[model samples]
Target: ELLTFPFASTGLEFPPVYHELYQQRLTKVRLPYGDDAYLAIRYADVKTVLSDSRFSIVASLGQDQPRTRAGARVGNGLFSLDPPQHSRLRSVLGRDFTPRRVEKLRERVRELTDQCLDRMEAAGSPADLVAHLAVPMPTAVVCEMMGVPEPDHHLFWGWAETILSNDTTPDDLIRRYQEFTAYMGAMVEERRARPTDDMFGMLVRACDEEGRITEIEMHALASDLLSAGFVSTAHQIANFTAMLLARPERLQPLVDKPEQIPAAVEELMRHVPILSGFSFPRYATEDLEMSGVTVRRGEAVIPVIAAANRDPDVYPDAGRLDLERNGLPHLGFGQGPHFCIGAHLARVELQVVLEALTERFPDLRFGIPENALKWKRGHFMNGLHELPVAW
Candidate 1:
């Protein structure tokens, strides 16, 4: 039943079954989390479920959530909290993620993009874009923001991979979790001794000066940032790049004007089917009726964001990729209180990377047939196993 979840749907596009269910308005289904849940697939219903307090994230963390693989415990990070607790944690780190603050990184992002492109160019034709560009670009940006030593970046990457892995042995998952916690704990201690300009240092000051957070909270927040900041952005970059290369007709406009890259990126964000399903699951706090379906108290509710983005009611011609489409509000970064704090930074990275790639390698194309490309399976994130490309 778990394997029947929306993400497991075949093809690069959102599965047709989701459309079949969504058009009927509401559908009851069994989730991979070992529970029967109402899966919300329409635009308005999905947003309503996400924004309403009746669907509590905290409640979902306990029995109503996904059944982890053996020893994997439900993480008590910001993703699993409610109102005051979630708001408090969010505020301590909010300033660093604001649009203005994220804008300051535009040049730095370009610098990193150029560096990766330089290496890719040196590697000559037929390079794996995943290795040379997509993976390293975001990884470098996140490591720089956290003040992680360049030599130790791989250590955090390994920890993130294992922690996010769905198929890792329970023993390996526990080992990676412990190692990441200890590593973040040490990093917090180092920041306490001497504060720097990175996000970790900013958090230390919030603890010391404002008393906004504690030592344990600091480690948890840092761990959350490390995982969230790097993993999704890296995969998105790869996904966006793949989307562009898949159609030369689509790629030509960005190469012709370059200034439209930002708009094109926004459209790609809307159209690209990155995450297979929704984010953290939400639980019904009380018996609630939504879109004509009755969800019982304590039952899990899975709001499929990927489906919402494609709902014909919101965006006209939702299934088509229109690079020039006026940027209508989409659920790509989500909506309401839990909207992604790093949305601005992600846009900056995507815009800069896309601009650099199109400008540098105007003739970039896939190194292998599109059908030969592979994707990582049995994971929550949607990403390529490798993006082999040539110019």
Candidate 2:
């Protein structure tokens, strides 16, 4: 049998093989990146692998690490770093993303969401939500937070797409990496010369005043922020919008009682299948037995977050969407040490957008047939190619 790590699926459901593998529980599988490793499909095993220090993220980024394909190896950022280093960097960056800090931006998020929806309304019916609302809102929010110039947002996004593309060649990756660094380096210098109150300026102060980080490190952090801070959130917003518009019954309650938007958003996060596979692959630091499967040291272990989120044992009615589900803790934003640093901000963004969207266009719906909607394939993130909607 051909061993495919991300088994192909139709629509929102996981491939049939995922159910098979999950039932078999903890099957060893081969990756396209050229290694055989254990696959954890159940929610418990996935969480264990993610939170376990024995599974070293740092090792996975090393020179000998396995990859899905041949390409330039990415540099070590917060996602790839282990505790001491990861904790140090995360501590400095965490302040900017705290609930208090992100709460202050609720108004700003509302304004941005309105602006995007306003543009969509102006475009009239049959507008593509992906183009008008989904893409621009997060783009504007992240760029504003990072202190990137408005005019340069498109350029930054272009570089990010190339860097994130799974099929990007080594030469292209290296070139894009250089260009991104050079651009961010100049931005850092500008902020150093004239610091503002934005997150980028805060980093500048942290570097110059406290000597907490080097200039090179500053560039890497900023670049990582640009990529991680916006890309997935943008894709997620588009995906969520598409999902709701497809099932108006799932959207009606939030529209009727806007206060329920937060809880509904949390449920949507759990229900949405945005992540097709794992983010950073973890390597076992030593021999260990997991779910009755033995994994050796130096072997790659992939914890499929998509599969885990749908584990029937953990979530009753795992395949269904329920906006009122209680204790809805899910792995959508991930878990453990590497839990997304941007989680608070992302939740704020999602809640703001969803509330604004439902309120503004209570009768919102798809402009095209549900089956006609195009889904992006062969990519790291799962997202709609375009979400055509009308109110």
Candidate 3:
């Protein structure tokens, strides 16, 4: 059945639902991208799909969709791999991506934030926030962590944009994938020849020490980090800033009680989940009964993170932004085994950006009318194309 809404018209909004029509069962809907699939809207059902070993992200049976990009096979990145393979690969990189590692990046993140802000201030009023802060901060962080040369950031960032753009046609995706893979492959070799303390260097060291990861897998892992790490955090930061700036009344609480910032960040994650698409789709490896609906093995299932986050049963007044809400558990970074590995790092970056802006530019204001802001139209991320601000 087709269920549509104005926001959902562009498929940028989360997939719309008609739970009443489905009689409390997980309802199947037509996806705009033309794949035959159903979105699981119920919280319990989505969680079940997320956690169930029977549901595999590696290969969704009957659905031959290979994670969309043409000619580029789905890489064994943490997102696409399942089970022992996922575990092994993740274990190798886990220590470096941990909270401790992310914490260490904070001082560096602050320095980057301060440097960018300094430049923006020197550029005078009417600075584009996306250019100055949102875009460059995370890109710089990931580049620094990856040991990619500073000269490559411009090209690498462009390649990342093309790869991450949902609207990118299959042909373009294939071309971009080849170029990206070639570049990353070369970088891997370079790191191998001369290792450093960067994440890529670490991965190279692990693979060399163990001789387990294939050259292709190493390339895939590095490529995955390049694609997922920068865009998601960048989009969320821009969106969160816009949300706060739009509602000045709430800004004081954040400033007065900086401790509440983390909780507040979680709430923002739920409220504005940045991505307009479903969380990574999973395939049922075996017959599964979730939320009273039986999903047969070989069928692909989508967990609507946006809907689940807003389920009133789980989050009271789910649509509203209330930092005080108790018992709140939102899938902003997702749940279960595949929960985002970089969540802590993303949170630290977001918190530091929020704190930096508020402290440095207490009188900061949007340079243009809020309505004049433009959003990225791609189906994956909900990002402002630009956010110009002035003091």
Candidate 4:
């Protein structure tokens, strides 16, 4: 049993509920759901939970694990499996995201970035950034990568936003979620009859031809990429843009020295509170020492990744954002065996957006009053429904 559950978190700050608790090596958290969890906030332990075999996302399957929402995850997606099985599914699509492969995509990414900016310009100043650029740019990139029909991108976005956000009840959530899966299955159905070199084609061949994975996993993989690739990347673009616009002193470095955009992107990710809550909720497969405490077997562990990014032990001035901070690896893309499969892709998208904005619209900023701007509430990602910006 947990000692207490933290009160709601809001805005760009770290959870004030955890401020005192961070003094403890480990803090027990009362979750909204059945499973109890030990909160891991330190940088080292955060990586441990993500990478360690002792902490198994696979074990949490069917056990229902720890989550705020009543609808715990079901079925084996890429994230639900461990080791050999996880490696099999990941390998099929992994080569497609290799640094070299992703590097070639930068030019195309810049093109998409430019197109979005052009639309924003044509639409005139005081336009919505979320719709004009944040949402569509990454969506288009991932769609092209998956060979999703251009016409159907909007359809995926509608289903995906529902799946990621926690604004709905379990019944509606499940119905809409399965609808997404079924649509993905239909796409997979088409991929098998007519395979191409696109990512979906590769997944189809892996399942039907290579005999590596099941038909179910292939569909799961596609849907997972759709959710993980498009939504989070989009949120980051908007989140990063909003944070920079709010802090011109920080934003100027990107405009003045374009080469620094890559480094600034890392600091922005580390600084921004993109996720509303915890990540990588896992069940300990066995007793293990973590953060100087014994996480007993079968106990759930939730890594406070956002907290880890702000850990004073690692980032000396944890509260401040330093784009020049030559720092240790942050949890921006996670770490270890399950490291972000799309790190290369996300890096390209984020970097290109920053580069394009700095080069094209150095005077860009929010047109709405800070207080008037609507921030997404009770949602998994910290984002705006529509960011009204002026250049």
lDDT tens digits by residue: candidate 4, 214-252 = 887887888788878888888888888888888756357
Please give, for residues 291-361, the per-residue lDDT of candidate 2 as tens digits. 77788888777777877878888888877777777544788777888888889989998999898888888
Clashing pairs in 4: none
What lDDT tens digits, residue by residue, belong to model 3 across residues 1-391? 5543212533123433432532466655555453445567666667767877877876644466423332233556787788777888777678878897789889999999999899989998998988888888898898888888778888777777776665677787778778887887787778778778888887787678778786667777787788777778788877888877777663666777777788878888887856565556688877877766788877777776767777757776665777666545777788777888888889989999888887888767788998788877754567788888988
* Top candidate (TM-score): 2
Of the pair 1 and 4, which is ahead by TM-score? 4
Give candidate 4 regions above 4 Å deviation: 1-7, 60-62, 167-170
Residue 135, model 3: lDDT of 82
Which candidate, 3 or 4, has the higher lDDT? 4
The alpha-carbon deviation from the true structure for residue 196 of candidate 4, after best TM-score superposition, in angstroms, is: 2.2
- Positional deviation of residue 221's Cα in model 4 after best superposition, in angstroms: 0.9
Pairs clashing within candidate 3: none
Each candidate's number of clashing pairs is: 1, 1, 0, 0
Better of 2 and 4 by TM-score: 2
In the order shown, the candidates' Cα RMSDs to the true structure are 2.1, 1.8, 2.7, 1.9
Give the TM-scores of the predictions, in the order they appear.
0.94, 0.95, 0.91, 0.94
* CA lDDT of every candidate: 0.78, 0.79, 0.73, 0.81
Worst 10 residues of 4 by lDDT: 1-10
The digit string of per-residue lDDT tens for model 1 on 302-350 reads 7778888888778888888888886567788887678888999999999
- Where model 1 places Cα greater than 4 Å from the true spot, the runs are 1-3, 60-62, 67-73
Give model 4's TM-score versus the native structure. 0.94
